Amino acid sequence: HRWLYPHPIADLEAWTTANWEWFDPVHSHRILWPDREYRPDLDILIAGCGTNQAAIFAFTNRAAKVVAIDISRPALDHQQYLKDKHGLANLELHLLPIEELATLGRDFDLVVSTGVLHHLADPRAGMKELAHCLRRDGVVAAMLYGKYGRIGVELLGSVFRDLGLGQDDASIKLAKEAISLLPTYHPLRNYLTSDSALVDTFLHGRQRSYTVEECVDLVTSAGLVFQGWFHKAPYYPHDFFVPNSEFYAAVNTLPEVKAWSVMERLETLNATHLFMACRRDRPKEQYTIDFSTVAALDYVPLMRTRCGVSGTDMFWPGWRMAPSPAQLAFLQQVDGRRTIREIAGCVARTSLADLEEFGRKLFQSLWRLDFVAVALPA
Amino acid sequence: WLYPHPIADLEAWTTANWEWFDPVHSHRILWPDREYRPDLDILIAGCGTNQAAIFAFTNRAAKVVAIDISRPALDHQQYLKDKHGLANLELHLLPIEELATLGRDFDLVVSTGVLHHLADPRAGMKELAHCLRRDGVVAAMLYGKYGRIGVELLGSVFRDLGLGQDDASIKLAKEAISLLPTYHPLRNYLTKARDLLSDSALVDTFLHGRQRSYTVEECVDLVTSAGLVFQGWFHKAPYYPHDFFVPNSEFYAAVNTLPEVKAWSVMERLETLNATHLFMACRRDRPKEQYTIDFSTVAALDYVPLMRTRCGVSGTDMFWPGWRMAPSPAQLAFLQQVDGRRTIREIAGCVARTGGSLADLEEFGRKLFQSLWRLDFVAVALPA
Ligand SMILES: Nc1ncnc2c1ncn2[C@@H]1O[C@H](CSCC[C@H](N)C(=O)O)[C@@H](O)[C@H]1O
Ligand SMILES: Nc1ncnc2c1ncn2[C@@H]1O[C@H](CSCC[C@H](N)C(=O)O)[C@@H](O)[C@H]1O
């Protein structure tokens, strides 16, 4: 490690008005725990916090107790800098490998381990230790690299290792020239469209990548349940953009895991698996999202972070479009309080069975596209 | 669904198209040290519908023996045999595993797109080796790992959806291909696969189980495991840095520093459109002087450059199949002296009698013809 990765953040007041952490409960509480309001007083473990992550969580959740572990002293030294600068009294730092988490003698409501577990000798033993740190209703939020999104990186990485390249300036120069000489069609060009991030990606040894089924098997091997994805978009047919496709109908017939497995092989830009795991003894009503049954009509749709409606447009982060007038009518009634049944009711005052059906299908489609989350009954 | 697509008429097909490993076209690549021989003994090991008939049609004085496990495939070779009077074509329903029953060896053994379909590809290559004369060549094609990513991705999806060879599966398969995002690895492959959406070729690629693909190192190991020498590539372009288009690249210099096989292995991972390994294998006891091409030695000055099929010079342009460009004036001067008779030394001599001493021009000639040999523009004739 020639430079610190990730790149150290100087000021969280600047960073947090512009950016956000995926698994920050301030933003993502309803995705982790669909059945409850934001809780400001969570016990949060950041397992492999690197330079910035734990300090961000402690800054945005001032009343939360944040415990952070890393094996890197320089990484923890930057968390300490951010701790001292911003008075993060709620942040506790340890030089500790994931393997020794039991030495903390604590369990947690949220365990975040993003971009860490592959660097372990035994990723399965790592996930087992995260599982043992989890309260009944707690969630492990994890990131692994995805096999089919990382093809380009693995190709160039392996070439750089066969040429004996390291982290020196001469190796970085050769590495950039190689990337500049890639033909237009090389798989790495799609991935590309930061000397520290270049070194971490290309010149820091092979980084294990995972299929959907390997992610699920890692989670179940640790005695945990695969709760689901942070971003659903990569893992489902986008039937909202392409309705009435017989091929997408045949994919939506398969059991969830086999269906995700198919879409990973058709949607190959996505290069990370962001997923949630929880305990077998967490009641399934807390987190089970199933738009196929009558219970879905009690789901309360809410706009996800940086999503919503502006006039006749619906927006995601960095993408806008005009839905059909009949679709917009449903989206205008999303307030984070009304149920799908209630929303169909409000549209009907502008059959009921047909509108409830259209509502259920629409919110299913937009949940799979990361436009709405759902609040489940308490 | 016969694959490959049956050809109706070889008189029409052969004026427009050609087989890579047809000795009429490619004799100097298989045997650099000798002229075309019209009377070769040729084995087509897994001939499919067309290939053996084409070889027999273009080499009328050659004895062509063809084997396949598919009766319908051999039935089309027979149709072509009867239509064109290919008395020099002998057909057998015989697996490669039972080749020894024919009790014959051959000057040329062609096995293109066949060996992966075997239970034991290495036992297949061993049986081809056992039927090869001292100076004979095995011309083989295996699918390449990094060029076939797209095919393997969609193939595996179709198997997980339980799709077969029925009309309903072919319709779903075409719709799936239409729904692939622009960046899907299969899309670049589809741009160069002219005939792949035809029902026969679609089924063969996507709906008839996984076809094993190979890295450069797996091809070389398959050949050496059978007790053969890896002679080289039919097309060198995929396996070398294109220093003719990008001279003085420090990265390409570092790749050209590696041992040959590791260097080929690197270029396979940088040049990922190429989806087939077309290579030649020969016996360890074939004299190395017959086929060894090494532009780094003084012997290279005695190499006779020859234009490869559908390559040459018209005025100030040089052409490949499907690509034209203007070389530097000093490059053109060398290319205008390629006649398939003059050596690299002689060519430098002719340029010198028209920006360099003799030593400098011989050096420029050696480097230029090395660059263009690696780009499949010139073959070389070696001394007898
Ligand atoms: N066994 C182990 N236990 C804990 N941390 C580890 C570890 N092996 C590697 N790490 C750390 O894991 C981190 C991965 S980099 C990712 C940092 C942070 N999770 C983020 O999302 O920004 C590095 O800081 C590395 O030092
Ligand atoms: N064990 C075996 N021995 C001989 N042929 C075999 C075989 N297994 C498969 N084949 C045949 O190999 C062929 C591969 S298709 C390629 C056809 C031809 N070589 C060409 O290049 O156009 C098929 O016809 C298939 O039936």
Author numbering:
A (entry chain A): 16 to 208, 215 to 371, 378 to 405
B (entry chain B): 18 to 371, 376 to 405
Reproduce text from the manuscript describing this model.
Here, we have investigated the structure and function of a Mtb methyltransferase (MTase) Rv2067c. It secretes methyltransferase (MTase) Rv2067c into macrophages, trimethylating histone H3K79 in a non-nucleosomal context. Rv2067c downregulates host MTase DOT1L, decreasing DOT1L-mediated nucleosomally added H3K79me3 mark on pro-inflammatory response genes. We provide the structural basis for how Rv2067c methylates free histone H3 and not nucleosomal H3 by comparing its structure with that of the nucleosome-bound DOT1L, which catalyzes H3K79 methylation only in the nucleosomal context.
To understand the structural differences conferring the context-dependent methylation of H3K79 by DOT1L and Rv2067c, and the basis of free H3 methylation by Rv2067c, we determined the structure of Rv2067c to 2.40 Å resolution. Each monomer (407 aa) of Rv2067c homodimer (Source Data and Supplementary Software File 1) is composed of three domains: N-terminal SAM-binding catalytic domain (CD), dimerization domain (DD), and C-terminal domain (CTD). The catalytic domain contains a central seven-stranded β-sheet flanked by α-helices, a characteristic of seven-β-strand (7BS) MTases (class-I MTases)35. The DD is composed of two subdomains separated on the primary structure, namely the large subdomain (LSD; residues 163-230, four α-helices) and the small subdomain (SSD; residues 257-291, two α-helices), which are inserted into the catalytic domain at β5-α5 and β6-β7 loops, respectively. Dimer is formed by the cross-subdomain interactions between the DDs of the two monomers A and B in a fashion: LSDA-SSDB and LSDB-SSDA, and LSDA-LSDB. CTD is about 100 residues long with α + β architecture. The dimerization interface, in conjunction with the other two domains, forms two parallel trough-like structures across the dimer, which constitute the acceptor substrate-binding trough. The active site lies at one end of the trough, deep inside the protein, encompassed by CD and LSD. Inspection of the Rv2067c substrate-binding trough revealed that the residues facing the methyl moiety of SAM (SAM-facing residues) occlude the H3K79 binding. In addition to the active site dynamics, the dα3-dα4 loop (residues 209–214, part of LSD and the substrate-binding trough) near the active site is disordered, as evident from the missing electron density in the crystal structure and relatively high root mean square fluctuations observed from simulations (Source Data and Supplementary Software File 3). In short, due to the lack of nucleosome interacting structural appendages and different active site architecture, Rv2067c is incompetent to methylate nucleosomal H3K79, but its substrate-binding trough could accomodate free H3 for methylation.
